[PDB]
Amino acid sequence: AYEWGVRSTRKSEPPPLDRVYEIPGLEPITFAGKMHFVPWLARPIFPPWDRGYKDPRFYRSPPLHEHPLYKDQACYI
Amino acid sequence: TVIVERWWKVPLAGEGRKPRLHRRHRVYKLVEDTKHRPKENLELILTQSVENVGVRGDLVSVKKSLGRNRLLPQGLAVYASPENKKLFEEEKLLRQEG
Amino acid sequence: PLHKYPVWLWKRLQLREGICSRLPGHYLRSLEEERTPTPVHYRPHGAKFKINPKNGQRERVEDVPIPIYFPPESQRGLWGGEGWILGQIYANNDKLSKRLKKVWKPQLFEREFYSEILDKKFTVTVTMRTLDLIDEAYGLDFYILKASGEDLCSKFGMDLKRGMLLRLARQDPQLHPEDPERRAAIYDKYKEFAIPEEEAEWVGLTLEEAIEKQRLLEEKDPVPLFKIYVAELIQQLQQQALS
Amino acid sequence: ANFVSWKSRTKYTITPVKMRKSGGRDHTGRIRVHGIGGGHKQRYRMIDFLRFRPEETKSGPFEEKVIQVRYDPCRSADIALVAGGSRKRWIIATENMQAGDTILNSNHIGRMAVAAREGDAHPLGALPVGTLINNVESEPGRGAQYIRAAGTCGVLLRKVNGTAIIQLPSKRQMQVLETCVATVGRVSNVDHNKRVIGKAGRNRWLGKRPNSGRWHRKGGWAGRKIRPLPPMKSYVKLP
Amino acid sequence: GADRMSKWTSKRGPRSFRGRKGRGAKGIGFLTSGWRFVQIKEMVPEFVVPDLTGFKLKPYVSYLAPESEETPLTAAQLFSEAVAPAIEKDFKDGTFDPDNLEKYGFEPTQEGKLFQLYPRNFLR
RNA sequence: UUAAUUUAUUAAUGCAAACAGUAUACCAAACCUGCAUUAAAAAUUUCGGUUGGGGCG
RNA sequence: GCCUGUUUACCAAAAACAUCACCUCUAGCAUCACCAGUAUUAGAGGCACCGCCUGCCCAGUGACACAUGUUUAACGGCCGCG
RNA sequence: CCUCCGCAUAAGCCUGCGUCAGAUUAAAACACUGAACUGACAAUUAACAGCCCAAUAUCUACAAUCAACCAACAAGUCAUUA
RNA sequence: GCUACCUAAGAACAGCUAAAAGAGCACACCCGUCUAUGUAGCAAAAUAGUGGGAAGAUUUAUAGGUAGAGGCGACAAACCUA
RNA sequence: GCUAAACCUAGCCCCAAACCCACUCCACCUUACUACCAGACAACCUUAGCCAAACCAUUUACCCAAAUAAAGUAUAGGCGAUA
Ligand SMILES: [Mg+2]
Ligand SMILES: [Mg+2]
Ligand SMILES: [Mg+2]
Ligand SMILES: [Mg+2]
Ligand SMILES: [Mg+2]
Ligand SMILES: [Mg+2]
Ligand SMILES: [Mg+2]
Ligand SMILES: [Mg+2]
Ligand SMILES: [Mg+2]
Ligand SMILES: [Mg+2]
Ligand SMILES: [Mg+2]
Ligand SMILES: [Mg+2]
Ligand SMILES: [Mg+2]
Ligand SMILES: [Mg+2]
Ligand SMILES: [Mg+2]
């Protein structure tokens, strides 16, 4: 099957992490304290972040697999 | 690793000083490389019984390819170090009693 | 005007300034050591004096290093004492021709190893000299722990060395309980080193990483002056009351 | 050089997507292919070259129905939207295909051959020897790539045991697996070589700049080469 | 050539530049999808002006006022003037506890009350 | 350019290391390294002397 | 010189370069232009419509087969004396 | 007497023939005083164009040319749903 | 940002003959074959017509890309800020 | 005698010594001199060339470790101008 997705147009994959996270029992020394992106070996892993207060201008809707009006069969409007 | 020698010869900038180099010293010349050489076989002591390449007991000098592929990663052979040979010969002497 | 210190002492001056002066002594000594590596791309001379032909007079000979280049692929993987040689090669091995430029490249074999101290397999594009050194050192952990910083020429090697040193110093459970005999045997096999904990954490770190670690250790949010004020006040009242 | 491709649509649709011309400009910006530039604006149509394809919760054969035959400026032949089921996809039209036609997209290979028409499609394992076919594939479930222009067609030669040698329009033989779906008949929009240009305005509208004016001396490759037929290339992977 | 020594104001760019530059005015809202401005009443600086009825203090001082020495008002003086008497009073009797100090005005964090000092939530 | 040093970068080659089966023999797949060759580029250069003005004689 | 047009901005605006017709060679093919195309296609070259036609050659060069050969609308050439 | 001009929009430094005193000197190709000036006084107030769009999945093949006859080819400049 | 090429969204072309047209004359517009004026001129390339096109291989407002061991080239060794 | 001639001080160069500095509030990485919103990609690389040898293809101090004699000695160098 001829796919319609171009690799140059889609989102590129992030580069792999450095060789410091593959060491069991060794914490990395990144730049999470200086609060600016560095040239010196500095690229950690940031945890996800969400907003505690909902904003109408920045509200994301949940997927379709858990809507209260979602059913198994599909209708035709 | 490619072993090369320096041309024009170093002028010897003292014995405790940094050797001063010139742009002409960049020219090298290939003399001998690690490849294109008849390889040698390493000694590995096996710990289990295999086919006709080894046996549990003595040692046999096998090739480097086989040792690095299907002997060391699978835990079928140990290096010929002066530390494990002592316990190996001790176990061999205790196995073959009088 | 003129300068007070030469141009090749500003690094030492900055190290002896303030923020870089709070570093421990062992780290500063390991950084200022600067030792020549082992000859790889050239055969070193036997004795310091060599008798050359054509004339029966002894002359002192010296072995000069080869300026090799270290790409980031060398720092990511585990390479030996080789690299890229950006030199020049004549035509038909004669100086009466043309001086061309030739850059040699080492051979890369993507293999897979198994560290016993860390108990985890890693995919490293290993060469041939590194495999030979591993076979001569009887394992990978011995090759990593015995070779100094001037022999690995890679950041992953120094990271592995520091991790093994921390694992051997902190006595942290490597595998898991229910079988401590294997961990005891592993710790007894690597007992001829045992670098203390206060010195193993500063092995292989660069200058920027060391400065960042020293700043994180010396962070400390500013304590409010109210506590110091009430402490001085209670001390003064106790001193004036107990007398 | 902020050169981004216009092929930014990972879902098949029916609305013609606007395309951007290039004129021989890659990602760097230098002209690498001469003779392209300046033409009439065109709209791209998502043409589905894979003939047999099951719908949602489907598996067996399905019927189709030709609606209307239009024209595609991106190629020489004309396209025709064929509706069927609960979806509509653009496919390549064939010769003698008008409105109100019925075509079949089957896949079950039978014991004997099938005397199909010049509109429906069937695998090569059920077609008689000596049938004008077109839009032949190379791998099972890959898509039609060979013989897709205007009027081009291929004829089946012989069969062995699991392969099917197809005679290409370049007089060259080429075999393929038996489980490959290929259309039957010839492509529409015939007599394309007889299309008289007339003036350079047509070439400028199509988007083709004139050739270089430099007088190049012909080397040794300008002579006629009377060469034999190259051997048949095989795509069947053998262990 | 064009000018270079002069600063970049709002009368130099074309139709696409007049708007996003401005003169440093503080925004009190945002925009929507219909070219409208949604002004929020909680973003405009509300000027709090007290009553000036019974206030007997002129903006100019008389020359008959005697002068005095000048000294900065550091935190130590305010501390010794405010918290020191209360601490001495509660310690001279026998009820001081170094575990809790929130009853003297000290706050361990600034996220509890509204008017925070270090992040400065108030304008001026 | 068929005037001079050379292929520094390709595709084809032969050799050496790297993998895996194979009854005293053959097969050398995809991707790295060095040596020598073939078509394109090229890193550089010069174009001697008298010639009752210079070339031709 | 097929035509319209364009070229030496600032001494030549032309018979000069291009244009449809014709001929030669190369390519069995999916993601960044070529091409979201399939040997009625694409790229590399010579003249440049419609009418009469393109007769010969691999000794020399290159290209293709390595079968001693094919190619000239590939580089070029088609006598003298009595 | 000319109007082969002007008024607006688009691009462009932003105060560049309004008043006052100096007008002895200084720039008008000479003068009055002012499109080649020194200091003070303040013009232009938006409704004009911008400053823009909360997401998850899905939908959009029958041109324009008075678009109603006809006729095409260079196959085309505009829309939504839960 | 002048000029060679490409890309996305726009604008321009009275009137007559309109043979269906990369048709003709001809406004505005694109370029400049010749005469006359000056070469320290209005101008480090101007002034009127005689000029070719002006429904398309035409011109233009905006934004972006192709630069020297190169860019581009309907090939002038033409252009890349006099 | 009109045009016009001279009147010293901002300091300017190198030594010895000394190691020299960087927020009063706001604005400064987008159209810097812009208060306010959802793909995190951005360094780690033989310098070259002119001249000289009457050309030029090998070669030509410049390389950042305190003086001097050794010594311009052995050496390298189309064994030559040179180093
Ligand atoms: Mg052509
Ligand atoms: Mg030509
Ligand atoms: Mg002469
Ligand atoms: Mg003469
Ligand atoms: Mg003509
Ligand atoms: Mg001219
Ligand atoms: Mg012109
Ligand atoms: Mg002219
Ligand atoms: Mg011509
Ligand atoms: Mg002929
Ligand atoms: Mg042109
Ligand atoms: Mg016309
Ligand atoms: Mg006309
Ligand atoms: Mg010419
Ligand atoms: Mg010279």
From Swiss-Prot, chain B:
Highest taxon above the source species: Eukaryota
Subcellular location field: Mitochondrion
Quaternary structure, from the entry: Component of the mitochondrial large ribosomal subunit (mt-LSU). Mature mammalian 55S mitochondrial ribosomes consist of a small (28S) and a large (39S) subunit. The 28S small subunit contains a 12S ribosomal RNA (12S mt-rRNA) and 30 different proteins. The 39S large subunit contains a 16S rRNA (16S mt-rRNA), a copy of mitochondrial valine transfer RNA (mt-tRNA(Val)), which plays an integral structural role, and 52 different proteins.
Family the entry assigns: Belongs to the bacterial ribosomal protein bL9 family.
Protein name: Large ribosomal subunit protein bL9m
Species name: Homo sapiens (Human)
Residues of the full protein shown: 53 to 150 of 267
From Swiss-Prot, chain C:
Keywords annotated in UniProt: Mitochondrion, Ribonucleoprotein, Ribosomal protein, Transit peptide
Any one GO BP annotation for this protein: mitochondrial translation
Recorded GO MF terms: RNA binding; structural constituent of ribosome
Signal peptide from the UniProt entry: none
Tissues expressed in: Found in a variety of normal tissues including spleen, testes, thymus, liver, kidney, brain, adrenal, lung and retinal tissue.
Transit peptide: 1-54
Keyword Ribosomal protein: yes
Entry-linked PANTHER family: 39S RIBOSOMAL PROTEIN L28, MITOCHONDRIAL (PTHR13528), LARGE RIBOSOMAL SUBUNIT PROTEIN BL28M (PTHR13528:SF2)
Name of the protein this chain belongs to: Large ribosomal subunit protein bL28m
Species: Homo sapiens (Human)
Name of the coding gene: MRPL28
Curated annotation (Swiss-Prot), chain D:
Stretch list, region Disordered: 204-223
Keyword Mitochondrion: yes
Any one GO cellular component localisation term in the record: mitochondrial large ribosomal subunit
GO terms (BP aspect): mitochondrial translation
Bias (Basic residues): 214-223
Annotated compartments: Mitochondrion
Keywords: Mitochondrion, Ribonucleoprotein, Ribosomal protein, Transit peptide
Keyword Mitochondrion: yes
Example of a GO MF term: structural constituent of ribosome
Assembly and binders: Component of the mitochondrial large ribosomal subunit (mt-LSU). Mature mammalian 55S mitochondrial ribosomes consist of a small (28S) and a large (39S) subunit. The 28S small subunit contains a 12S ribosomal RNA (12S mt-rRNA) and 30 different proteins. The 39S large subunit contains a 16S rRNA (16S mt-rRNA), a copy of mitochondrial valine transfer RNA (mt-tRNA(Val)), which plays an integral structural role, and 52 different proteins.
Family: Belongs to the universal ribosomal protein uL2 family.
Full protein name: Large ribosomal subunit protein uL2m
Span covered, complete protein: 61 to 299 of 305
Swiss-Prot record, chain E:
Subcellular location(s) of the protein: Mitochondrion
Alphabetized UniProt keyword annotations: Apoptosis, Cell cycle, Mitochondrion, Ribonucleoprotein, Ribosomal protein, Transit peptide
Tissues and organs where the protein is expressed, per its UniProt entry: Present in kidney, liver, thymus and testis, and at lower level in brain and spleen (at protein level).
A GO molecular-function annotation: structural constituent of ribosome
Signal sequence segment: none
The name this protein goes by in its record: Large ribosomal subunit protein mL41
Principal location listed in the UniProt entry: mitochondrion
Protein family membership: Belongs to the mitochondrion-specific ribosomal protein mL41 family.
Role summary: Component of the mitochondrial ribosome large subunit. Also involved in apoptosis and cell cycle. Enhances p53/TP53 stability, thereby contributing to p53/TP53-induced apoptosis in response to growth-inhibitory condition. Enhances p53/TP53 translocation to the mitochondria. Has the ability to arrest the cell cycle at the G1 phase, possibly by stabilizing the CDKN1A and CDKN1B (p27Kip1) proteins.
Any one Gene Ontology BP term: apoptotic process
Assembly mode: Component of the mitochondrial large ribosomal subunit (mt-LSU). Mature mammalian 55S mitochondrial ribosomes consist of a small (28S) and a large (39S) subunit. The 28S small subunit contains a 12S ribosomal RNA (12S mt-rRNA) and 30 different proteins. The 39S large subunit contains a 16S rRNA (16S mt-rRNA), a copy of mitochondrial valine transfer RNA (mt-tRNA(Val)), which plays an integral structural role, and 52 different proteins. Interacts with BCL2.
Stored Pfam families: MRP-L27
